[PDB]
Amino acid sequence: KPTAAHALLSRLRDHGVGKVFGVVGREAASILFDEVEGIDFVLTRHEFTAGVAADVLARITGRPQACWATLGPGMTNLSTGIATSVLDRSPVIALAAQSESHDIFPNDTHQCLDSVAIVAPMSKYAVELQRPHEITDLVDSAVNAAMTEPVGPSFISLPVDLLGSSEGIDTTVPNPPANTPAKPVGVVADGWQKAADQAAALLAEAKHPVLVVGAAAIRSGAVPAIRALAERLNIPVITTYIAKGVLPVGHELNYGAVTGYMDGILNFPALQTMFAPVDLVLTVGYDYAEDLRPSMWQKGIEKKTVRISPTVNPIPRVYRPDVDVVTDVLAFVEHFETATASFGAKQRHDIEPLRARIAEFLADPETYEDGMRVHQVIDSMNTVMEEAAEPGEGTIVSDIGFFRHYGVLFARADQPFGFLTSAGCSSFGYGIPAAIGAQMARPDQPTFLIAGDGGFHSNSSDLETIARLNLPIVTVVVNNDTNGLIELYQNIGHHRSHDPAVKFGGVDFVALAEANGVDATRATNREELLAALRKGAELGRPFLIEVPVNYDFQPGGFGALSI
Amino acid sequence: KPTAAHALLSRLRDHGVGKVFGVVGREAASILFDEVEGIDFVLTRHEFTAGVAADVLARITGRPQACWATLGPGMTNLSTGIATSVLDRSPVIALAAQSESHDIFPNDTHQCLDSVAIVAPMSKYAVELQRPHEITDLVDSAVNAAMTEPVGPSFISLPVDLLGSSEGIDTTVPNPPANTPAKPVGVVADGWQKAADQAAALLAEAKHPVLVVGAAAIRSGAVPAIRALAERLNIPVITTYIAKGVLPVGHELNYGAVTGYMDGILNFPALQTMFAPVDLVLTVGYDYAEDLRPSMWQKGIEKKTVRISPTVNPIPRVYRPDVDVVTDVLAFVEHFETATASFGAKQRHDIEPLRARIAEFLADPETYEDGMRVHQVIDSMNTVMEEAAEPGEGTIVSDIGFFRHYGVLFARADQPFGFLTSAGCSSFGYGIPAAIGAQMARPDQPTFLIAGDGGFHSNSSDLETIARLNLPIVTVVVNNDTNGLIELYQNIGHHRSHDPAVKFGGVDFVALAEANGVDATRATNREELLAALRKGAELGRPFLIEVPVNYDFQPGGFGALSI
Amino acid sequence: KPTAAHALLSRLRDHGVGKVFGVVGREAASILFDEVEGIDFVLTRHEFTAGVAADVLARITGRPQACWATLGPGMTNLSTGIATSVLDRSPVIALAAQSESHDIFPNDTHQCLDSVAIVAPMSKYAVELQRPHEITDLVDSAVNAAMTEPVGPSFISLPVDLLGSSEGIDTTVPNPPANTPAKPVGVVADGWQKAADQAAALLAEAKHPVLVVGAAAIRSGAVPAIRALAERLNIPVITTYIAKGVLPVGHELNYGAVTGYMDGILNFPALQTMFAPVDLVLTVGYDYAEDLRPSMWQKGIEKKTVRISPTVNPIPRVYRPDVDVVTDVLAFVEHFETATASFGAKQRHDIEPLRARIAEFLADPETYEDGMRVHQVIDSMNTVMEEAAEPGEGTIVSDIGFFRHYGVLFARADQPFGFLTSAGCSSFGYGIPAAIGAQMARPDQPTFLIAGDGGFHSNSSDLETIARLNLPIVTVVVNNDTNGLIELYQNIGHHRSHDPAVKFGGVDFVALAEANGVDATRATNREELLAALRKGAELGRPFLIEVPVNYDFQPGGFGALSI
């Protein structure tokens, strides 16, 4: 007779779920994962990989995804993936086993932790199953909470005895309709249209407005609408890290992405050039978690600001917009098109010196004694991605480190979510599972990953998962035998380094990949790197490329990082 | 120099607050309550009274209100008022003092409790002040969270040292605009208009539809729009306890309020009469906490259901509507008017047998040996309220007990919130604070309170507050020396009473009132009661009437209460 | 068949419980309270009264006691009683009903709150019943945690369906042994004997040592041991509020109790007299919550300190003793008797100017225009209590307010817990329930209560309970139409009053008591008061006395209140 295990997998399938990522423990006595046709288990080497792969799959598909862990330490390993999902905003259903219900004594029973209490502060919803047949409504409530803005994960704790139980379960009676939201449910304030009208009046009087676009605008389905608004009225578009690609590469209104590290990296007044003459900032789908902070746009002349978001402002201490429009992003744009219908196009401010500096970094022909420079690595990746991918296709994924902020400035994105990194959480080791998630969401597109030696090695065991699933991801490891970003912070704070806190011995990443069954090679210059990338791109199997790199810090150049 | 106490009162004033209800403790060394013109302290005898008075004032005005307690046991006493606000849904800012910041050791310092941890499970928002100048943004964040559906209380904990500090506070810089929401912010599903269209299509095919209206519809400002729709299409309106009055007394479409006790109280198939021939139930602003449960309308023929609510369904285990419309109630009705503009009037179902039974109870001419019956008491109150109030004015307030369900069935309500009682929380003692709130919200209207001996005496000390404020409330205490509802439940479960758990000795409430400075009299029949009420209504001062009553229990007739 | 209701009451009986205090709600359908012989329900007017009466009964008997509330607002009302028990340290089992187990949706179901989450921060143990037969082991675990130092309350949440269920229950099998601890289980550090020997070495070198005794010493059963030790070595004994009476009235080593208000009340350098020449302070059963703070004994010369407690020091920010002895108090005294066996008796220091000042207040012969003075009221109570009680018997109970600290200074205590007040929580309204608890623990001794108008009236409804139980308590209400303590704090912080936060209108407390069935009279001078008290003491029924009082503050005299 069918149990709560069958009822759970069956209800996930009603919500569109086809994959469950995770690591299975002793609950395997209660759940096989073959109970239900059309839903497959994806075994990873660590739970973090499972949670992040589901997060990225959820982001690109716009549908709820699922991950799985065992009791105790499985659940705690999964929590970093849950944390990724709450801060990066993706609808993940996280599931973990628990001790037999009559034996639940947290911190006393073997492997028994108070899972709901640990996960509740970092989730949209968190419950423990108590009566086997209720798992259907628990899944529904979890999906409901996950798909409400700010989107995030929901958690269900599953005692092994109840999971294997058929008490109260009747599969002859069909399940009620799932009614999965097509896009996230939002918060809407009374009179938002009047606030939108007030923003239109500010726009009329503005000489140099900009649109600053966040990931929430992509979730809402507002990209085509935003593009048409900016095009008609001649308004520049600036983005957060993952909102890169809302305009295609080469578009005249594509003014780039912001990272607080950009002035220090380029050795240039980059933020001043972007924002100094701007008099109106419209932050369309604003989220403070994406790390584009008001302090960053506050350059030069005084500005008016308009916040548009499907949530009430959580941070009035930091951001007090002149006009606050609490509504669905697409709904705002469609109303705003009506309010600005008869407006004349603007004159946009000049940022050519900034564009030249960036182009100069990408074209950098110099060779160096201590390896390549990261901007040269990314230029090579851009070239081969453009070759390998159809127009508007392809994904570059970035792990976390100093190199990541080079990705923000320099990486090609020819579609929304075409450059993927961790927006709010920024856990190192993100890259592999995000590349797994990206390649599964876009099976016929090229997927390149860039990672640093510190972050890559924190989670490199799931190379074996990439080989086992035969996912044709091409990985570049930029290696400096250091947690580089942290050495920068040491110098910023103390004006010197302390090696015991940041420095590694050597790891042969080529030999490491090959030990996992992934073909690999070392590249030490542009020519060797282009050849490696093109070989990887056409291989039909995963490929890894190790590149020696180095940084030259200017610690005085990073005042924009202050909080 | 102005302190955080001044900045706190000033920001409340900015959100429209004119009264702070509470009991002040040793934090009086940091806050006098004379700092800001236009905001006055209202001292009560118990913190429960303060929280409920603020709750009721918030409900009637639709504006955030404020209450105040000291540290430790002050905060725990206030928490029953907070629980009222969370379950009854009203926007209250609850403020409590805390131990000096450097001396916060919960359960170790004198009177030190972990206030945030204790209140967080029953609030929209809960925070402890840490930096004195931030009090302004904490008040804003509290109001934001309180005024989002489901509306509820927000809590700020105030260490006494920081409350009296002026560090970082500069009142030469004016506060930014308050932007207080004019009605609650709601959640809104994408494609709600299509769902509203599916609802119109169900109505098109229905023979006997009904509108079941809850408090959320009133908060949304939807009463006049709901009435116009009901009148155009000849659709009957049924209500929860506190949505009584959405239609005037006498209106032909006013089919009454529902209580799970109605069949038992009337010895009549009341729910079957209301719901049996109905084929479509629209639950307009549904909230389970109001205790109109799906089991109550599931009588007779199979029905389709439409849920309309500014929240995602929190209870799919219990309620699975055929159509779910997640949106602002008024927005739903306005869309629905357009979608049903071509529709004509339905034939409504006949409930005259139920109207006859109710009328029989109210007209009951018998004189009993053992005191009055509660239905005779309410009929006398109805009579004088009609005499005393202008058309569409007056409030009858009810405390909690068996008699309260007679109020639901029998009490007059000639306006929205014209009959006030506690919907979700149902704490005994509610009556006095609710009458204080109502009389302050409607200063020129008559306010009657009905309370039983058990619940009234639990909180009778605030009779002094009524005297001190000179609020012309007329109170009727229905005395049977028993927790009557609880004796009913003993008999339902065990088929007998147990007196030590439910019976009191005698309290002379006339003498009790007079000890508090409130004139009072005893009434034992309709003629005595009418005369006492008429004198009460014209007195220009508070007045109390004690009436001996008895209940004729039929414990086997309450099957509708099963959960 | 016996249900979990039977199993619960029966397991309470096994732990020596004979009374359950509280208010029953709709869970009366599942529990009558006649299931088990030897355990009786005690019905109160408010849940706060039920919690305090159990706490006080537990404190005096040294045995676990029990209280009861309904779901939602029953539980939150009880929670002020739970807070009393956690801060004042008494082993109370607190029990509250909950929604039916399958219908638990906190803040969504009618009267449903997350009880365990609300209570957990203020309790030793908190759990919800899930499987009916497990109630036996939940009671045992509740008792285990409550009877471990620091002693405090344990909480069990009881869903009404499980409470009424017989699933898994078999009463033909006897319960396992209860094994209730005779005295609290305590924390013991390795090498405490060495630390005790270090303390003995400090005592040898000290010219003027003192013993500061707290409530934990009494709980340990260490009173005779401490007295014998102090008498041999000629060491003065100073006490916290409820440790008054560890030495009999008039004993020469009885140096009195400490309150931070003492210098301000006495208009005298009282703390300087007590502590200035002291070179060694041994704090025996120290507990910061009792509000005898290190700052209070830090007068005159530098001191060494010894902390003895059955708990690890929770406040090293505030109190860093020279020697820390973590062990059972009686165990320390017995070891300390051996380590100091050969010591010569000490020369104790002079406090006669303070003794003379206290005696002067007690004998005050002036007749005032505006009422009696509180020291005159307490003097009168002392006289009649001495007349009425056997040697080493009688209880004076104090509620909370400015008069309470007069009680600390002036009130007679001829046995441990002979003067009773709230040590750590200090909730007003404490007096009535504490007098109920005291009178039931000491059925053959006189019980006097002193209370102020503010605190008393916050909880005056339980006068009916006293009347109903026929408890021969004699109550004195000292009336000044003010929350007097709070007016003092206004003057301390601001140098002026603000009446809206502190002032009441007239309440006739004689008339109020008579309305509740309690004989009462008004007294305005010593002669009338003594006559009223002597009448009350020989009445054999409860009696209430109202006394007009006034205070004349010197707000500059309260610097010792600084934190």
Ligand SMILES: Cc1ncc(C[n+]2csc(CCOP(=O)(O)OP(=O)(O)O)c2C)c(N)n1
């Ligand atoms: C889970 C986690 N722990 C610690 C950090 C701090 N941290 C951020 S990025 C990073 C990696 C830096 O090293 P690497 O991947 O080699 O990038 P690099 O800065 O050298 O370019 C570290 C250690 C982190 N981001 N996440």
Ligand SMILES: Cc1ncc(C[n+]2csc(CCOP(=O)(O)OP(=O)(O)O)c2C)c(N)n1
């Ligand atoms: C704070 C709280 N504790 C307990 C209850 C359970 N309860 C509900 S109403 C009530 C009082 C019922 O007696 P009364 O007010 O005299 O009205 P009656 O039932 O006699 O008509 C009680 C004890 C409650 N509602 N609230």
Ligand SMILES: Cc1ncc(C[n+]2csc(CCOP(=O)(O)OP(=O)(O)O)c2C)c(N)n1
């Ligand atoms: C539950 C609670 N709320 C508020 C306080 C602050 N407070 C302490 S005692 C007290 C009463 C003081 O008035 P009264 O009982 O008349 O004694 P008085 O100070 O006038 O002597 C108050 C309001 C408190 N202790 N407990």
Ligand SMILES: N=C(N)NCCCCC(=O)O
């Ligand atoms: N604006 C800032 N200071 N941002 C901090 C960035 C730290 C996260 C990261 O770069 O991985």
Ligand SMILES: N=C(N)NCCCCC(=O)O
């Ligand atoms: N549907 C029910 N069983 N309702 C129970 C309501 C209990 C609270 C009351 O009667 O006020």
Ligand SMILES: N=C(N)NCCCCC(=O)O
């Ligand atoms: N040391 C102090 N400041 N004590 C404050 C105690 C205030 C509570 C009371 O006096 O009842």
Ligand SMILES: [K+]
């Ligand atoms: K191409």
Ligand SMILES: [K+]
């Ligand atoms: K790992």
Ligand SMILES: [K+]
């Ligand atoms: K009239």
Ligand SMILES: [K+]
């Ligand atoms: K005597």
Ligand SMILES: [K+]
């Ligand atoms: K009370």
Ligand SMILES: [Mg+2]
């Ligand atoms: Mg590195």
Ligand SMILES: [Mg+2]
């Ligand atoms: Mg009654």
Ligand SMILES: [Mg+2]
């Ligand atoms: Mg007073």
